[PDB]
Amino acid sequence: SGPVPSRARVYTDVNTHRPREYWDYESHVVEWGNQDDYQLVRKLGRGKYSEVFEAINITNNEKVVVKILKPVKKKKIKREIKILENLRGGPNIITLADIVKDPVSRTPALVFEHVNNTDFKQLYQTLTDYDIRFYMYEILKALDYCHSMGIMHRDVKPHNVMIDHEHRKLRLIDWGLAEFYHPGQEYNVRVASRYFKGPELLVDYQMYDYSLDMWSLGCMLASMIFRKEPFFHGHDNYDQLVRIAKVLGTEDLYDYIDKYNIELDPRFNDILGRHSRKRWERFVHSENQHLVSPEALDFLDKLLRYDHQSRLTAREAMEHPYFYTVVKDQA
């Protein structure tokens, strides 16, 4: 027999109740603006899928950010655009302002609201205990929103969480890997950065859901409170699961594989070994103890579960004691 099916615990059928055009992005028609409205100022970054620039909208003198896409299948561009338009205006979601056809590359360019970024490699070393709870709460607002809208991000990691620390503002960016959740759909497991891939991706379990983003969030939280980046530091996708298993233990891993009748890649046989579940105290030391508390460890533990069905939802996470003071201040 094959793998046991799975469905999201929450927001399971939200896309089914929408009109088909909400999620049928292959049939999305792109609304193009005027590429002459924008003059590039300077380059801000580059990646495998795009280059990102500061630009000026010369019709109103507004600063914007322009993401010029490298060649990719048009259906992937339609996907990202449709998701950005669906999520526009949601809390802490980057705002897509315009779409233009770049004259040189002949590829699309997405135009986004400007947001000032403090690079995480400089910010994360100055964050207080309170800052981490605050910004984790703000990320959870974006994840609960997009999940409630039927969308999983699938690429949650520090580079995709832009933080203007001076104004305590945060935006979840790069929706190029995001997808619509449909019950029973089997998804590509070649998503997310290595260090943030959930166990379902590493064992090739395709019927995953929003809870994938909650694993990635737990990896971010561990790296911030323990000041260890990345927290699970694998050499490849196989070794990545080994690094997880040396912390979470192999017993719950094999229980997970058994529960969903997952056929484990035979490469894993010789490398996973047998490992006890470790106590989080072993990652606490004098340089990070001010960021670690019983509340943080309880919250972290409830995110980092092999069984995607047993991880906190974004809404459950927001109600955890770790956020009581953040919640009280925001009232």
Ligand SMILES: O=C(O)c1cccc(Nc2nc(-c3ccccn3)cs2)c1
């Ligand atoms: O893919 C996306 O959705 C997206 C949306 C907005 C921005 C970026 N990417 C980058 N933005 C910067 C940056 C740095 C300083 C000030 C402003 N932006 C550097 S890399 C990506």
